[PDB]
Design a protein around this nucleic acid. Structure first.
Ligand code: ZN
Length: 252
DNA sequence: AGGTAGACTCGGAC
DNA sequence: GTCCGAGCTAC
């Protein structure tokens, strides 16, 4: 799920679990559990707690319980569902939170790639994986000035900068390529080479790109196809270790 | 110093 | 057998 999808998950899941009390936690793939390191401690501590809220930070879900917060990252294919304990589990179900009402919050992930961390609520923000997370891209805390400051200080490409979770929260590969296209900026450009004008324009398109989604791609995955603005074939290379898509005419 | 790159996690699709 | 996407170790 992308940031906008996580926000949608956050919004839709909350009513389905709020006020429910955990009676058991069943773990079928312990490696998903990152903190406490022992999956048996993770399960034990959550038993008896009631779900009070669900927040989002970047692509992280933060389940707020009585004492603890469960911080959950789904990566690409992780999915939550609420369903009856009487019915068979779906394939690739790795963790199940059983509620006293006979319902379950189930975490599936064919890729077994997601993570869960549990800490006392008051500690979650200063521990992994939330520690160091940059500002929400739709927040005033993410400004052209902030972006400019990170850009000047680094030798990395502008794409590498935008992919940095400490720079801005949860801006994935797709939105990075799309935003840079809309801003007219090549992804391989050194971040420090961007003019003030370019920094402003980039900030503006990041917000619009991700803002529009929280309510049709120009370049991502469209390599070999015509640019939608100028008809030039979209190209794909590797930048910052990622598949990178761009129009060599629109972007400079 | 810490910025930065690399290792590492996984399995569906070539 | 090799790729790839997000987010602790060691130069
Ligand atoms: Zn173009």
């Amino acid at each position: 799920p992308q940031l906008p999808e996580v926000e949608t998950i956050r919004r839709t899941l909350l009513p389905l679990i709020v006020g429910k009390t955990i009676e058991d936690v069943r773990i079928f793939w312990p490696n998903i559990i990152r903190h406490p390191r022992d999956s048996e401690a993770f399960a034990a501590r959550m038993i008896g707690q009631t779900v009070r809220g669900l927040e989002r930070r970047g692509k992280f879900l933060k389940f707020l319980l009585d004492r603890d917060a469960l911080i959950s990252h789904l990566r690409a294919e992780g999915r939550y569902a609420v369903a009856s304990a009487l019915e068979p589990l779906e394939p690739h179900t790795h963790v199940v939170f059983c509620f006293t009402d006979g319902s379950e919050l189930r975490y599936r992930d064919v890729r077994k790639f997601g993570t869960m961390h549990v800490y006392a609520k008051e500690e979650a923000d200063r521990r992994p994986p939330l520690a160091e997370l940059g500002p929400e891209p739709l927040s005033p805390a993410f400004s052209p000035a902030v972006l400019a400051e990170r850009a000047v200080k680094t030798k990395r490409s502008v794409k590498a900068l935008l992919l940095d979770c400490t720079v801005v929260a949860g801006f994935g590969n797709i939105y990075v390529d799309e935003s840079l296209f809309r801003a007219g900026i090549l992804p391989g450009r050194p971040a420090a080479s961007l003019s003030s004008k370019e920094i402003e324009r980039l900030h503006e398109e990041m917000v619009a790109t991700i803002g529009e989604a929280v309510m049709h791609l120009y370049v991502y995955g469209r390599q070999g196809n015509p640019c939608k603005r100028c008809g030039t074939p979209i190209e794909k290379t590797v930048v910052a270790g990622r598949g990178t898509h761009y129009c060599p005419r629109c972007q400079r």
